[model samples]
Target: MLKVDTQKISPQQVEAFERDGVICVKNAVDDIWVERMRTAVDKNISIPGPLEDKKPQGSAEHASSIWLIDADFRALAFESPLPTLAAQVLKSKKLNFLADGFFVKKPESNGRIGWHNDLPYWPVQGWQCCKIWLALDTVKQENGRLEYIKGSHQWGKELRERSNPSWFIEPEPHEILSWDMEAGDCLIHHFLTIHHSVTNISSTQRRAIVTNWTGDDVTYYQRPKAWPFKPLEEIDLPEFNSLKTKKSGEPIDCDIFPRVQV
Candidate 1:
C-alpha cells in the first residue's frame, strides 16, 4: 500500500493543480534526507558512471549518473515524500516506477531541456504518470529552475516532436510557472503537464533528482520502428488519451488515485 498524507495538502491546492496542473510543496523533504541526497550526489560525481557520457548541448561537463545507476538512488526514490504524494494525487491503488533522472546544470551551461510534457515522450500506456522534482540545491529563476505553463496539462494529447537539441516544444501559448526553490523542496506535476528548465548561468551548481511514476494500470509500449523493441500495440482504452486534452474538471476520483496512508 502507498504511505503518505493527502490531507496535509489543502483542498485549494488540489483544486489549483486540477486547474493549473502543477504545485510546489515547500520543505517537502527534511534536512537529513537532503544531506543524504547531497552526499550521494557528491559521491556519484566523484565516481562517475556510464550515463555521465551523455552531455548536454553546449556544455563541457556531462550529467553524472552514478546515482541513477546506483542502488542508493533507487532507495531515495522509494523513500521520497514526493512519491507518497503522487500516490495520493493519482489515487492509485499501486504505483509503478517509470524512470529516475539526475539533472545537473553548471555555470555557463547551454544544455537546456526545452519545454515539453512528460507524458508525450514516455512509452507508458496510462494517464497516471507523474513527476516529483526534488531540488538538491537552491534553484532560482536565473539559475534555470523549472518553468511550467499554468494550464498546459489540459491541452490533451498532442504529439510533440522531439527536437535535435534534446528538448521538446508545444505549439501553444502558456504561462510559465517559476519558483525560488530551496534544497529539499519539491515540485510535483502530472504526466501531461507542460514544463521545462533552462541552463544554469550561476557560478554554483544546480542539481535535482527527478522521478516519474504511474499506477499499476499503466503498461509499457514499444515504439514502432524503434530500435531493439518489437512492433508496439496499444494497451489502455483509447478514451484514456483524452486525459491529455482534459481541461478544468471535477476532482479525480479516489479510485483514479488511491490514498497512501502514512
Candidate 2:
C-alpha cells in the first residue's frame, strides 16, 4: 500500500529502486507543485539569496538547504507528496528532510559534475538517506541529465576524495543508467549511488529541485576534520549553526529536519 497523493508507487518500482539504487517516477509531482517549484527556482536563479549572492555562477550553479530561506521550498518539502514518496520507497515509518538542492544549468554550459557518491560528503549516515530530484524543465542527457551506476550503492565503498581518474571511466557491461525526463517527473536515488551529470550542451536550460530525505535508519555522523561535512561547513552563516549542533551517531531529529507526516 505504498502511495503518495492519489498515486501508488508500485511494488515493482520499489524492488527496482532496491536493485538499481535509483528509479524514475513519472509525474511524481503534480502540475501545481511543478509550476510553484518552477517559479521558486527561477526567482533564486534571477536573484539569489544571501547563501548564493556572492558565489560565482559559472554556467551551472546550485544552492543547498534552501528550505531554510525559501518558503516555497519549505512548503514543497513538508506539504508536498515528495516525502511520502520517499518513505514508501524507503519502507520506513518515518522520514526527515535532510536538505534541498536547486540546480540551474544554463544552456550550452560545460559545467561537469563528476562521478561520485554523496554520502561521504554529507553530515548523516545510513542506507536510508536518499535524494529525490524533481525536474523543473525538460531534461535530457544532452542537457545535463543525471546518470547513476546501476546497483552501485551495494558496493560497500565510499569515494571520500573529490574525484579520481579511474572512477570516471565507464565500467564494463554498461551498468550506467540515465533517463530523459519531462517536467514534473522525478528520480529517487540512493545517496551512495555513484552518479554524475553531463555538461549542458542543449539550447534549453536544465533546472531541477532536489529534496534529500533521511529515513528511520539514518543518523548524524560528523566526519573527521579531513573529511568535514560539506553541508553546514559555512560557519560564518548563523542559520547553519543550528543544524551543526548534533553529535555523531545521534538521531537527526532537530527542528530543521522535520519529520514527514505521511
Candidate 3:
C-alpha cells in the first residue's frame, strides 16, 4: 500500500492546496523510499552525471537529475503512489510524468534560489501542472526550507525573477507557511505558485527531489532558454524521431514524457 491513505485524505487539505497553491503532505512516502532518496543524493553528488552540475563548478554547486535518468527515482515514480496523489489533487483524468528534479544545497551553502513562479522557465503551458518536492531530511528555516507567499498562485500574474518582498498581497500573520518539515513528508504546489527558500546556514546538507507533473491538456511551446532544454538538447527522448515535432509548438506526449500508471 502507498504511504498516503487516499481514503483518509481530508477535504480541508485538498481545499488548501487549491487555494494557497502549495501544501505539505506528511509521510507521503515510506521510510524505505526515504532511504533511497538519501542514497540517490549521495551517489549523484559524488559520481556526478553528464547533466549533473554540467556547468563549471563555482564555490557553490547546483545540479538536476531528472526522474528519467535515475534508477531509484524511476522506481519512486513508477512504483509509488505519488502520481496517483497528484491526479487526486490536480483533478485530472490522465496525468503525465513531466520531470523530476534534484535541488540540493550543500552544507552551509550560501546564496538563494530566488523567488519565482515555476511556469515561465518551462516549455509547457497549462494550468494542470504541479510539482511534488520530497524531503528526505529535517528542514528548518535556518537550513534551506521552502517558503510560500500564501495564496500567491491565485494572483494570475508572474512576478519578476528574484523579486523582493514577494509579499505583494501584503501580510497577515497566517499568510506565509514556512515550517521545519520532517523526513517522508512532501510538498505539492501549482506551477504558478510564488515560492522561495533560504540559504543553508546549518552544518548539514539539504536535498530534495521535485517531480513535475502535467495533465492531458499540456502542450509544448518553445521560447528562448525554454527550460529543461539546454541549447539544442532537451534531456533524452527515448524515441526522439517519433516525438520530435517539425514545428516549435507541440505536445510532449512522447517516450521521454510518459504517463503515470496505477
Candidate 4:
C-alpha cells in the first residue's frame, strides 16, 4: 500500500466523479514534474527502448519507453497525489500498481483510440481499478483530448457487442461528453468507465501519461484447463483456487499478469 495525502481532494471532486464517472483536475501536477516527464519523453523518443507490442495507430514503431519502467516515473507513480485520490474512491488502505502507458499524439495524427472500458479487457476482478491520465502538454478538443460517456460507469451494464475498431464507444450509445484540457491537468476515471480520445489534428504534439491502479482484495485466478498463464495470482497475496471444477477438483490453473513496480 502506498501512502498519500487525501487532504488534497475535496468532497466536490468526489461528488463529480461519482455523478459523471470522470473528473478533470487542473494543475494537478506541478510544472517541475511536467518538465521532468517531458524531458524523459524526448530522451525516450531519441533513444528508443523496447517497442510495445500493442501500438496505437500513427504511433512510431520505435516508441518503446514505457514510462513506468523508468525510475523517474516510478518516483512519481509512488508519490503522486493521484494515487491517494484513487485510494479514496476505492475506499481501500492500499493500492497496487497495475500499469502505465504513454500516449504521444503528434500533429496530423488521425489515429484515434476506440471507446472501451478498461475492466472488461483486463484480467483483474471487480471495477476497483482507476486510470489517471496526466497531460504533459496542453490538450484541446482538436488535439484529441479524452472524452467520456457521462455516468456510463454507473449504468450497471456490460458491453455485449464489440466496439468499433477506430472508435472506442459503441455507436448505439448516443450520449458522450468530450472535454478539452490544459497542461498539468488530469482526467481520472474508473476501470469500468467508457472513454475514448480523438485524433490529434493540430500541428503541436499532445503528450499524456496514463497510470492504472487497483485496490486490495483482488486476486489472480489460475484455470488449469487454460494455458500456463491461465492461473493467476494476486499481487503479494496468497495463491488460491476457490473456483473448483467438477471433473477435476484440483486447483484450477491460469496465468497472472505481473504487476510492474518502479
Candidate 5:
C-alpha cells in the first residue's frame, strides 16, 4: 500500500485555502495532543486566569495563552507539525507562534459565539495570519459547530475593526460552510474570515483550542480595548531583531515569539 504524506498540504488544498479562506484538515493533530489539552483545560479552569466566566453558559472562555502555563501546550506550540503547516498555508518563509487558546463549552449550555472576524480580536496586523481550531471532543452541530462565510477574508476593512455583529445574520451568505468535528480534527482559517457558532445544547461538553500563527509580515497594533490574550506581553520574548517599516508595530521575531527557523 502506498503511504500518504498527511502533513504536507497538496497544491489543491493550498489553492482551496487561499480561495475560500478556510479549510478543514481531518486528523490535523493526534489523540495524544488532544488528551494533553484536556488536562490543560482542567488546570486552566481550576486556577482561572485574567479571563474567566463562571456564568451559566459562559462556561466557554478564552482560556488565555496556554503555553505560558502548561508544559504540554508549550510543547504543542513549539514542537507541533502546525508550525510547518502554518508556514505552508501562509506561504511564508518565516513564522511566529502567536498564542494558544482553549474554548470549553460545558455540557448543557446556551453559549453562542457571536459572528466576528478574528484579526480585530487581536493586536496583530497582517494577511499571513491564521487560526487552528482543534476539536478535543466529538463536535456536533447542536453543540456549537463552527460556521464560516465563504470568501469573506477578502471582504475588506469595513468588515474589520468595528463592532462585531452578524452583517448578514438573517441575510443569505454568498455561501456558508461548517463542520462536525471529532477529536484530532481541526479547522484552519484565515484571520479575516467571518465565522460564528450557535449555543451548545448537547449532553457532553464541547472543547476546542485555537492556536494562532503569524508570518514574516505580521506586526503589533494598538487596540482600544484589551485583547483577550493580552497576557502574552507579561512574558519575555527572545530578541530577534528584524525589520520592516511597521506603523505602531515592531518586528515580532524574538525569543518570546518563537520563530519557525525552517
Candidate 6:
C-alpha cells in the first residue's frame, strides 16, 4: 500500500486557498501534536498568562502569544511542520512566526465570534500574512466551527481601524463555507478573509489554537487605534518591548516575530 503525506500541502490545496481565501486540510497535524497542544492549553489556563483574557464562567476565553510563556507552544511554533506548510501555501522562501492564539469555548454556553477580517486588527501589512487554526476538539456547526466568506480576501474592502457594526459585509448563502473538522484537522486562511463563528451549543467544549504566520514581504505597520492581540506597550516582557519601537514599514522579523529559518 502506498503511504500518503497527510501533512504535505498540495498544489490543489494551494490553489483553493488562493481562490477562496481559506482551505481546510484534514489530518494536517498528528494526534500527538494535538494532544500536546491540548495539555498546554489546560496548563496555561490553570496558571493564566499575562496575555490571557479571563472571561466569566460559562463564557469563552482567549489568550495570545502563548509561545512566549509556554514551552509546548514554543515547540509547536518553531519545531513543528506548521511553518513548512505556511511557507508552501504562501510560496515564500522566508517566514515569521507572528503569534499563537488559544480560543476556548466552554461547554453548555459560549459566545459567538462576529464577522470580521484579521488584518485591520493586527499591526501588520502584507499579502503574505495567513493564519492556521488547529482544532483540538471535534468541530461542527453546533460546536463553533468557523465560517468563511468565499473570496472575501479579494474583496479589497477596508474596514475601519476600530471595527464597528457597520463593517460586516452580509455574505450570500452560497458564498459561505465551513467544514466539520476532526481534532487534528486544520484550516488555513488569509489575513483579510472575513470569518465568524456561532455559539457552541454542544455538550463538549470547543478548543482551538491559531498560529499566525507572515511570509517574506510582511511588515509591521504603526496603525493608530489598531486593535492588537494585546497592545505592545502593555506587555512588559523583553521580547515585546522591541516591538513597541517598530515603525510602519519595518520588517516584522524580530525577537517576538522570529524568522523561520528554513
- What's every prediction's RMSD, in angstroms? 8.9, 3.1, 3.7, 7.2, 4.5, 3.4
What TM-score would candidate 3 get against the native? 0.85
Q: Rank the candidates by TM-score, best first.
A: 6, 2, 3, 5, 4, 1
**Model 5: residues with Cα > 4 Å off, grouped in runs:** 1-7, 50-59, 158-174, 226-247
Candidate 3: the clashing residue pairs are: none
TM-score, cand. 4 vs. native? 0.72
* Candidate 4 ranges beyond 4 A from true positions: 1-6, 46-68, 158-174, 221-262
Q: What are the per-residue Cα lDDT tens digits for candidate 4 across 1-262? A: 3567344557788777888888887777888889988876766654434333223345421242254357766666767666776676665565666556567877754567766766655445555667888888878888877888888888665442244444343545457766677777888887777777778788888888777777665543332332122333322223223222212322212211223322
Q: Give the lDDT of residue 116 in candidate 4.
A: 70
Q: What is the C-alpha local distance difference test score of each model?
A: 0.63, 0.80, 0.73, 0.62, 0.73, 0.83
193-236 in candidate 5: lDDT tens per residue?
A: 88877777888878888888999788777564446444433434
TM-score (C-alpha, index-matched) for candidate 2: 0.88
- Please write out the lDDT profile of model 2 over residues 95-150, one tens digit for every residue: 88887878888874558787787787777888898889999889888888999899
| Poorest lDDT segment (10 consecutive residues) of candidate 6 | 158-167
| Candidate 3 lDDT score at position 258 | 76
TM-score top scorer: 6
Q: Would you estimate the TM-scores of all the predictions?
A: 0.71, 0.88, 0.85, 0.72, 0.83, 0.90
Clashes of 4: 20
Task: Say which prediction, candidate 1 or candidate 5, comes out ahead on TM-score.
Answer: 5
Candidate number achieving the greatest lDDT relative to the actual structure:
6
Query: Please, what are the lDDT tens digits per residue for candidate 1 over residues 132-246?
Result: 8888899997676888877777768533424333333443433677789999888889878777777788888887777767774665553343211222133132422433333
Model 3: residues with Cα > 4 Å off, grouped in runs: 1-5, 47-61, 163-174, 233-243, 246-250
